[PDB]
């Protein structure tokens, strides 16, 4: 109706007046439309790779003609057991624990965690992360959820296939996964990954698991044994077991599972007789997804783990002109700065908090803008027609790519987490932030349209990563990663005394027509927290100049328009409105005009009157950052 009242009723429902919704998924919108053009065009690149007549001359062209593997599946059927039987013969030759652990470590290189992260007090401990997980099923819980076992009505039928060896597989194959479905910790603990921190030496990891070689395995995993001596063990309650399984679970008890796991490690694109057999376990019986994936889903569904930072270099070259880099170089130099200067005209902070809130912003960073460094992939060699051992080696250094990044630093522009995702997170330990360019793609960011709308809608969602990067919880962390509220509670209480309305407001609103974790307002502090700076660093980007006053609509009025169109998201929200309390987060549908109320930069911008609906009276507004 009226933009200041509902921009997303003024603009955004018309997509929802017309748009489909997927029968297989039943959700589509902001992120998923960026998964769409992420997925819809990466196919076009390999099509362009295959369209080109690449005969010889580069080591990167049979990579881009690897897709001929998936074409003639009658061809790929003819190999079948023989490449596998080599992979069996690795295992069949592997007699002892050391022979197997060193055997499978190369298979593990061939690609059936880590982040380059120091302690944030030590600037140096860039190591790997080791927890417990081995369940073929979605989580360990399906063992102990004894009532959640009608789901197992035909599970051991569609997996025990590989006269009686299938039966003795069926004796074997149900027997251990229950024991793999035991030692592993609750999911939502991992969705706020908390107790992983045990900064171990690998001298500890050899001491950790009794009965398994944790090192010559790792040399078969291909890391630095001498030159990288430490890790982060997280949850070794299985890892100690696993080695004791490696002690006690015998090789024949391992083997036909390990072969079942090995074929699972190369499941989909192989001899066609057995590819639906795991799908009809997984697709039709574990998920009931009977849509046999069309090929353009399939061939795209593998390349990224095979090659992470490979397409994205020429992807932006084959999609985006050079116009978009100066947009970063002119914008975000101001945003990371002027967020400091937004602290200034806050006229009630504490000086020991204000100057502290200033001083934390000559030091702050951004993994945004053309990556300075890129991982080489042409010199990584992949056949046009071979696929199986072709991508073993293709995966083999995919382990050891990150090995080098144990030695290499965060150079601030290469995207450790992949460019082609739809992700965003601040590091409460390291105080880095991460923005893969799906959020920086259009329609979020047009690289050639007007600036302030392309500035507007994005910058508070950036600033909400800052604003939730600087929540009370973001404040409860330190710049060196220590857990401490520098933001002393006496303002937070007064700011809770200002934001008492924010505790209460969504309770006066209804998720569904009528005929519990709203105690947290977590998604909404930082968007007002981010819009605080969306309309300030612009002026630092102006250096006091006037924003582009075009069509009777200035940059600030256009910064409204940056947000006013860019939330068209459709679904059926019975489960969703029912799903809300698994974590106390908030949705976007209440968010999409919630920040009209307490802000004042919009009212002075748009001249809001003293009685309106999305007007809020100033004694219940909150001049946090305005």
Automatic annotation (TrEMBL):
One of its GO terms (molecular function) is metalloendopeptidase activity. Residues 3-371 form the Peptidase M13 N-terminal domain. PROSITE patterns: NEPRILYSIN. Belongs to the peptidase M13 family. Its cofactor is Zn(2+). Keywords: Hydrolase, Metal-binding, Metalloprotease, Protease, Zinc. Residues 423-622 form the Peptidase M13 C-terminal domain. PANTHER family: FI17812P1-RELATED, ZINC METALLOPROTEASE FAMILY M13 NEPRILYSIN-RELATED. Signal peptide: none annotated. Pfam families: Peptidase_M13, Peptidase_M13_N. GO terms for biological process: protein processing. Its EC number is 3.4.24.-. One of its GO terms (cellular component) is plasma membrane. It comes from Mycobacterium tuberculosis. It comes from the Bacteria. This is Neutral endopeptidase.
């Amino acid at each position: 109706a009226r933009p200041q009242d509902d921009l997303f009723g003024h603009v955004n429902g018309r997509w929802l007046a017309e748009h489909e919704i997927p029968a297989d998924r039943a959700t589509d919108g902001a992120f998923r439309s960026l998964f769409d053009r992420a997925e819809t065009q990466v196919r076009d690149l390999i099509i362009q790779a295959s369209q080109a007549g690449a005969a010889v001359g580069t080591d990167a062209q049979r990579i881009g003609d690897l897709y001929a593997s998936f074409l003639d599946e009658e061809a790929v059927e003819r190999a079948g057991v023989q490449p596998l039987h080599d992979e069996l013969a690795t295992i069949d030759s592997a007699a002892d624990a050391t022979e197997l652990a060193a055997a499978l470590g190369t298979l593990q290189r061939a690609g059936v965690g880590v982040y380059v992260d120091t302690d944030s007090k030590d600037s140096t401990r860039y190591l790997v992360h080791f927890t417990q997980s081995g369940i073929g099923l979605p989580d360990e819980s399906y063992y102990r959820d004894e009532q959640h076992a009608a789901v197992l009505a035909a599970y051991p039928g569609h997996i025990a296939r590989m006269s009686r060896d299938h039966a003795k597989t069926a004796d074997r194959i149900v027997a251990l996964e229950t024991k793999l479905a035991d030692a592993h910790w609750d999911v939502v603990k991992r969705r706020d990954a908390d107790l992983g921190y045990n900064l171990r030496t690998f001298a500890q990891l050899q001491t950790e698991g009794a009965g398994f070689d944790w090192v010559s395995w790792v040399t078969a995993l291909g890391s630095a044994p001498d030159a990288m001596t430490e890790l982060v063990v997280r949850q070794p309650d299985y890892l100690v077991t696993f080695a004791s399984l490696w002690a006690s679970v015998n090789v024949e008890d391992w083997k036909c599972w390990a072969r079942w796991r090995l074929i699972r490690a190369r499941a989909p694109w192989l001899t066609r007789a057995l590819v639906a057999e795991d799908f009809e376990f997984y697709g039709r019986t574990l998920t009931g997804a009977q849509q046999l994936r069309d090929r353009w889903k399939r061939g795209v569904s593998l390349v990224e783990n095979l090659m992470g930072d490979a397409v994205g270099k020429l992807y932006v070259q084959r999609h985006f002109p050079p116009d978009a880099k100066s947009r970063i170089d002119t914008l975000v130099d101001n945003l990371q700065e002027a967020y400091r200067i937004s602290i200034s005209e806050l006229d009630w902070m504490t000086p020991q908090t204000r100057q502290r809130a200033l001083a934390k912003l000559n030091k702050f960073t951004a993994k945004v803008g053309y990556p300075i460094k890129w991982r080489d992939y042409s010199k990584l060699a992949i056949d046009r027609d071979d696929l199986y051992g072709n991508v073993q080696r293709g995966y083999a250094v995919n382990h050891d790519r990150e090995l080098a990044k144990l030695f290499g630093p965060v150079d601030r522009d290469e995207w450790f987490m992949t460019p082609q995702t739809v992700n965003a997170y601040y590091n409460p330990g390291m105080n880095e932030i991460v923005f893969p360019a799906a959020i920086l793609q259009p329609p979020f960011f047009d690289p050639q349209a007007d600036e302030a709308a392309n500035y507007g809608g994005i910058g508070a969602v950036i600033g909400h990563e800052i604003g939730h990067g600087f929540d009370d919880q973001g404040a409860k962390y330190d710049g060196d990663g220590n857990l401490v509220d520098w933001w002393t509670d006496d303002d937070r209480t007064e700011f809770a005394a200002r934001t008492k309305a924010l505790i209460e407001q969504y309770h006066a609103y209804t998720p569904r027509d009528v005929d519990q974790g709203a105690f947290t307002i977590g998604e909404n502090i930082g968007d007002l927290g981010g819009l605080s700076i969306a309309l300030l660093a612009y002026q630092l980007s102006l250096n006091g100049n006037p924003a582009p006053v075009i069509d009777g609509l200035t940059g600030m009025q256009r910064v409204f328009f940056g947000w006013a169109q860019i939330w068209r998201t459709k679904s059926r929200a019975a489960e969703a409105i029912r799903r809300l309390a698994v974590d106390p987060h908030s949705p976007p549908e209440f968010r999409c005009n919630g920040v009209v109320r307490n802000v004042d930069a919009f009212y002075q911008a748009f001249d809001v009157t003293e009685d309106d609906a999305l007007f809020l009276d100033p004694q219940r507004r909150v001049r946090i950052w305005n």
